[PDB]
């Protein structure tokens, strides 16, 4: 798709067989998703301060689908107030900025 | 142009006669630029944190050029470590996300 920026670029993503709303965030290097069940192994990271705040599971090799575009990469899964798709996954779906 | 996201979308902007590097940030509502002189009247504003963290100066109607594309809008000027071009300005240059 082509997404304008008049509103927050929130799209439906599929992750863990669930549909979630998430922000396409070119300002984010990485991807944070609301707490949910994902299969298997993950490592503890903390994020939210300069250093860290919020306990998130780093899951590698997570398949996410965005508007029909499958991407695999590292996802931080915890109580973020917003699901955020950063560049690590934006690049996987071929997402560019255009003007 | 078409900016891919393998790297941060840092571009050259021209503002107040000055050339700067700025992050094209779809996760940002507004545009914050590092401490500099602009000719307007401004309004004191607080941004960041939980109800305000840093004092910035809100300059309305500022002409800025983002990769050769002219836009006018509100620029906040303050101690930001990163010049951020938010959606308020990305929309003015007709910037879209595409995949």
């Amino acid at each position: 798709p082509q997404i304008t920026l008049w509103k927050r670029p929130l799209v439906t993503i599929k992750i863990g067989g669930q549909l979630k709303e998430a922000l396409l965030d070119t300002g984010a290097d990485d991807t944070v998703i609301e707490e949910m069940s994902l299969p298997g192994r993950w490592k503890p990271k903390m994020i939210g301060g300069i250093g860290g705040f919020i306990k998130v599971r780093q899951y590698d090799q997570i398949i996410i689908e965005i508007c029909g575009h499958k991407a695999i990469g590292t996802v931080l899964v915890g109580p973020t107030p917003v699901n955020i798709i950063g560049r690590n996954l934006l690049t996987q779906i071929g997402c560019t900025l255009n003007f | 142009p078409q900016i891919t996201l393998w790297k941060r979308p840092l571009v050259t902007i021209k503002i107040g006669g000055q050339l700067k590097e700025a992050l094209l940030d779809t996760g940002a509502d507004d545009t914050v630029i590092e401490e500099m002189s602009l000719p307007g009247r401004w309004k004191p504003k607080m941004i960041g944190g939980i109800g305000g963290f840093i004092k910035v100066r809100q300059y309305d109607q500022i002409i800025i050029e983002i990769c050769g594309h002219k836009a006018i809008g509100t620029v906040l000027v303050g101690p930001t470590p990163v010049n951020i071009i938010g959606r308020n300005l990305l929309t003015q240059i007709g910037c879209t996300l595409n995949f």
Binding site: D29, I84, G86, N88 | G27, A28
Partner: peptide, 4 residues
């Protein structure tokens, strides 16, 4: 915005 920064976010990562």
């Amino acid at each position: 915005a920064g976010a990562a």
